[PDB]
Amino acid sequence: DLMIHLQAPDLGSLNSGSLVYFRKIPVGKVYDYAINPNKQGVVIDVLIERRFTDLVKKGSRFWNVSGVDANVSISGAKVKLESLAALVNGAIAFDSPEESKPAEAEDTFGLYEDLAHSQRGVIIKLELPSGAGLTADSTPLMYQGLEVGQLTKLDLNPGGKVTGEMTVDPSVVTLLRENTRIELRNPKLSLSDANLSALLTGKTFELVPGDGEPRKEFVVVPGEKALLHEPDVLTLTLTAPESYGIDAGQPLILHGVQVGQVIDRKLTSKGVTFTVAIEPQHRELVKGDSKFVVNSRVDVKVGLDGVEFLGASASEWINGGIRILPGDKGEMKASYPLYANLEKALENSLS
Amino acid sequence: DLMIHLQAPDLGSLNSGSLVYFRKIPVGKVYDYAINPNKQGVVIDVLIERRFTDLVKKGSRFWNVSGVDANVSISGAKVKLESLAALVNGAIAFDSPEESKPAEAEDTFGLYEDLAHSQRGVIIKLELPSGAGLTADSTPLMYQGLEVGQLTKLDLNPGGKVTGEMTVDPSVVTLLRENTRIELRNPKLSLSDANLSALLTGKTFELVPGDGEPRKEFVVVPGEKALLHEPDVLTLTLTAPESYGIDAGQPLILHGVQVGQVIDRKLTSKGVTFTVAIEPQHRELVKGDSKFVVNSRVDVKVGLDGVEFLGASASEWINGGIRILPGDKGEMKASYPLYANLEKALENSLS
Amino acid sequence: DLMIHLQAPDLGSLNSGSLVYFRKIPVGKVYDYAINPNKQGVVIDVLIERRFTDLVKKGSRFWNVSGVDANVSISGAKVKLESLAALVNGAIAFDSPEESKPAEAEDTFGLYEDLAHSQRGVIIKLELPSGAGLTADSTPLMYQGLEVGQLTKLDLNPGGKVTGEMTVDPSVVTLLRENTRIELRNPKLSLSDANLSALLTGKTFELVPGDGEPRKEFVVVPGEKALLHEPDVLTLTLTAPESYGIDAGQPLILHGVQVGQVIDRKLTSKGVTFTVAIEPQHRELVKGDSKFVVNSRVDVKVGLDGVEFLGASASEWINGGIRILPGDKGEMKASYPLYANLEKALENSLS
Numbered sequence A, B, C: 001d002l003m004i005h006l007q008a009p010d011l012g013s014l015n016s017g018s019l020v021y022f023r024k025i026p027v028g029k030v031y032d033y034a035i036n037p038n039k040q041g042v043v044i045d046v047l048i049e050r051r052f053t054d055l056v057k058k059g060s061r062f063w064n065v066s067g068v069d070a071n072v073s074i075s076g077a078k079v080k081l082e083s084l085a086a087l088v089n090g091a092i093a094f095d096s097p098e099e100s101k102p103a104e105a106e107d108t109f110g111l112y113e114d115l116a117h118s119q120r121g122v123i124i125k126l127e128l129p130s131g132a133g134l135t136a137d138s139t140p141l142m143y144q145g146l147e148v149g150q151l152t153k154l155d156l157n158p159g160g161k162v163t164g165e166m167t168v169d170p171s172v173v174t175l176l177r178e179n180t181r182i183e184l185r186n187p188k189l190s191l192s193d194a195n196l197s198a199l200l201t202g203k204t205f206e207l208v209p210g211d212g213e214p215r216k217e218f219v220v221v222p223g224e225k226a227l228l229h230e231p232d233v234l235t236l237t238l239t240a241p242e243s244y245g246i247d248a249g250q251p252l253i254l255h256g257v258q259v260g261q262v263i264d265r266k267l268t269s270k271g272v273t274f275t276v277a278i279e280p281q282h283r284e285l286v287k288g289d290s291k292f293v294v295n296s297r298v299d300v301k302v303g304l305d306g307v308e309f310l311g312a313s314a315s316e317w318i319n320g321g322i323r324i325l326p327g328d329k330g331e332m333k334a335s336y337p338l339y340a341n342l343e344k345a346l347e348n349s350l351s
Helices: A170-175 A196-201 A223-229 A280-286 A314-319 A342-346 B170-175 B196-201 B223-229 B280-286 B314-319 B342-346 C170-175 C196-201 C223-229 C280-286 C314-319 C342-346
Strands: A002-008 A019-022 A025-035 A042-048 A062-064 A091-094 A108-112 A122-127 A139-143 A146-157 A161-168 A181-185 A204-208 A217-219 A234-240 A251-254 A257-267 A272-278 A290-294 A299-301 A308-310 A322-326 A335-337 B002-008 B019-022 B025-035 B042-048 B062-064 B091-094 B108-112 B122-127 B139-143 B146-157 B161-168 B181-185 B204-208 B217-219 B234-240 B251-254 B257-267 B272-278 B290-294 B299-301 B308-310 B322-326 B335-337 C002-008 C019-022 C025-035 C042-048 C062-064 C091-094 C108-112 C122-127 C139-143 C146-157 C161-168 C181-185 C204-208 C217-219 C234-240 C251-254 C257-267 C272-278 C290-294 C299-301 C308-310 C322-326 C335-337
Touching: A122 A146, A146 A204, A146 B146, A181 A223, A223 A257, A251 A280, A251 A314, A257 A280, A257 B257, A272 A280, A280 A322, A290 A335, A290 A342, A322 A342, B122 B146, B146 B204, B146 C146, B181 B223, B223 B257, B251 B280, B251 B314, B257 B280, B257 C257, B272 B280, B280 B322, B290 B335, B290 B342, B322 B342, C122 C146, C146 C204, C181 C223, C223 C257, C251 C280, C251 C314, C257 C280, C272 C280, C280 C322, C290 C335, C290 C342, C322 C342
Parallel strands: A002 A108, A019 A091, A062 A108, A122 A217, A139 A204, A234 A335, A251 A322, B002 B108, B019 B091, B062 B108, B122 B217, B139 B204, B234 B335, B251 B322, C002 C108, C019 C091, C062 C108, C122 C217, C139 C204, C234 C335, C251 C322
Antiparallel strands: A002 A042, A019 A025, A025 A042, A062 A091, A122 A161, A139 A146, A146 A161, A181 A204, A234 A272, A251 A257, A257 A272, A290 A322, A299 A308, B002 B042, B019 B025, B025 B042, B062 B091, B122 B161, B139 B146, B146 B161, B181 B204, B234 B272, B251 B257, B257 B272, B290 B322, B299 B308, C002 C042, C019 C025, C025 C042, C062 C091, C122 C161, C139 C146, C146 C161, C181 C204, C234 C272, C251 C257, C257 C272, C290 C322, C299 C308
8 A cells, every 4th residue: 555645734624534536536545634743734644555556656746626616607607516425525636647756655745725726837927017907816828819827826025016926838838938928908898899708807818929048937017018018119209398188008000000009108397208119010111200290189270262170080089199200211219209280290390 | 631711702603512623623622601790702611632732822813613604706606615514513713823822721712703803913993984885894905906904893983983993914014104095996987997896896995105103093085085195295275266167076287197186176255266286296397386277168269360279178178177387486375376268377367 | 490471473483492592502492382362473482591590681682593594795695504503493592781670470572583673773753755765674874874774664654655664773863863864865876986886775864963952753855855954954936937948956056166956846827936945055155145047058159259158068058057146235035036148147137
């Protein structure tokens, strides 16, 4: 027989004589339990049967299957009663890996509290902005619309620094590399596709891959700020004497299509300084010379022969933002001015 | 063996012979129970086993784990059946701290009714405005989006004075100091981020830290009023002959960006007197001389050569509030006038 | 031993041999039960133990704890299974007050059906308008946002007169006095604070205190009418030849701020007579002379040099109501006219 030790933070629903499973086959039983010298944890020593000993490995993980847990899920709640024997007495299930040395001679093991906590994978440290919609064991990592990871830990370090960590699977671990971003998605209001599922899930970690050296720790930034930290991005600080009603997250439009986004708005004594960003595809297309025109205000001129509507359209007005007048050749200077309307941008009159 | 006394307000689901746990290990049993001379409470005396005696400390807390409690939670309701033995007979669990003297010789203990009531921490007294959305054991203290505290008590003192108290954890207790504000957040309607969780939680205590001497009692004010009690803030009483449709909580705008907020509106016999406030960052930027223009009313002038739209924009009109015309140098006088539109503010004609 | 009688409207889940609790300690048992000579009620006589006899008092209340009751509550439903012994056989719990004579010699007692029905307090009779959203045991009395009372009875007397009664706690009983109003609140639609709790609760009795002799019966009026019955209030009957689109509950505005409310609109053969009311603070401020101008209609005049927008603003138009032009000195006469717009009020031309 095999006499191995398990280290648990508490005994749980396990009694002496409760049963140990492999593939839901009883292959042993719990022999004894005792508090170790430190008050922190309970050591539970179990006894595998003589013929089953080979099953346990050095790289085995043991988990606890005891009691009935009921889950309420969106789009229907499937409550299934799998194992009746675990209710009365409790149980411990375990996995056997492919290639590992067989365990022997009172080898210790951590006892995970669930099958989901005993999933293999790689710990990935995150430096989160806030834990506003994040949950300790309930926030997933999406990639291509599929659940790849799970936020497994969320702490508030002193100094006001929210940090967490995440278990990601191996196939994605190969994907993880330098300049690979993890940004949090808000459950944004969708008008074209009416889905309750996105609203119910809440915050959602999105993975966008990159190339370079493999890294195992990332920094998460807010969705508005997320654009700034792209591998390729163009960051322009543009000045203006007034905000002109341009908020921090307005879209930024060239030739009718959104090519960039305003990132943030800072008020100074000289005026309002914006910091806008630009995507890689259109980085070539700006070409270092441009004019910047406000689309947040409407302008109507009435006349007997001259009738004109300037600087906005109703869809553009509700969207708002900054319009680009692209030029032919330039040096991509640091500061640009923000013109009040189009004709003052053609006149080059910022006053 | 150890023979200690527990003081409970009622017996609960505990019978004689019910079981006492440490880390869910049975380490004793309930020996007897009797009403003490005052009718108020029940004294339950228990018996720890001889070898387990060392586990009990002077700083131990005992709590009650008996019966089945089912919780319905937003985004899914996880009902887990942990302990079967507590249903039939009842149980008492207890904690052992790190450094305390061992208890002996019929030492009394308070019996908490739950694990959540037996959490360690520091009582923080609050002087609340009202208990409109507050709950006795269900209102949390957020800090950086994480649950830090729990409103544990809510009373209505005579004179119409709602006061409560709160258990906060030690790491935050270090943070708590003079000029550290606790303000209540309303579940405000969010258009950009659609989250059901904020609406379901309701009122929410937000912690914003400050520096100075550590204090252990605070005064909570309503969210609109909360701005006024900041460590650094500028409070201007500005007069006007009419409200001009400016409500008590309108935003207050310099150069297009909100720099302050109107706090409250008082009607007098001379007119309408507002009291507006100003954030620390823009306190330097006002510089003691300014003009104050209403943004709540639209003004259209039609003409053959003169066409103009004055004092408002559609987003500004729905937002409303007061616009600042900043000056160069002044003394930051007490009273300011509120001009009806911009050209009367340039003409300095308040009539 | 003590042999006392209980009078219940029916036996309930109580059997002979069911158990009697004090602080959930078994201190007796049910001895027998028999129908009394009138068919109305069942007399249940119980037997307290010899040493426990002192516990029962003249001012004791006995209540019934039998069966399992499950409650579904908003923001989560906490179903807790407290007492297992009451399910099979039934139970009776009781309270012992602080200062009362001990009961003896077959003293009768009413048996309340629940712990909530056995709460101490003072019966307060209410003369309700209707029971449209009221519930027999589920409508609370709020004071400062806290639950103070509970509507315990709701009857329809002949003649179409809905009357109910309410148990209020002692501390508030000290507050209850002459000119202290109890008005019912509707779950009004709130745009600034999104709370599901207010909508789910429904109708809600609000307590506003006053001074004078203590009274124990009140008259509840509808929320619109409630203003009229204030301790200090100004009631003006103002005439008009047309309603001008002014509904029964429009706000009434001086200097941009709401100082009063229209109470009701009555159509006569001469015209439309309104009855508006005025709050105590602004009662001094009207000063007996004023003009009354409709804010419910817009007026646009177009001209080459004269452009003007008269009698309304978009927020005022959606709000509607009556505007005051305050005067210097008057006698506070009974009837006032309602002018169609502002310039006819300055011309004093009601035709």
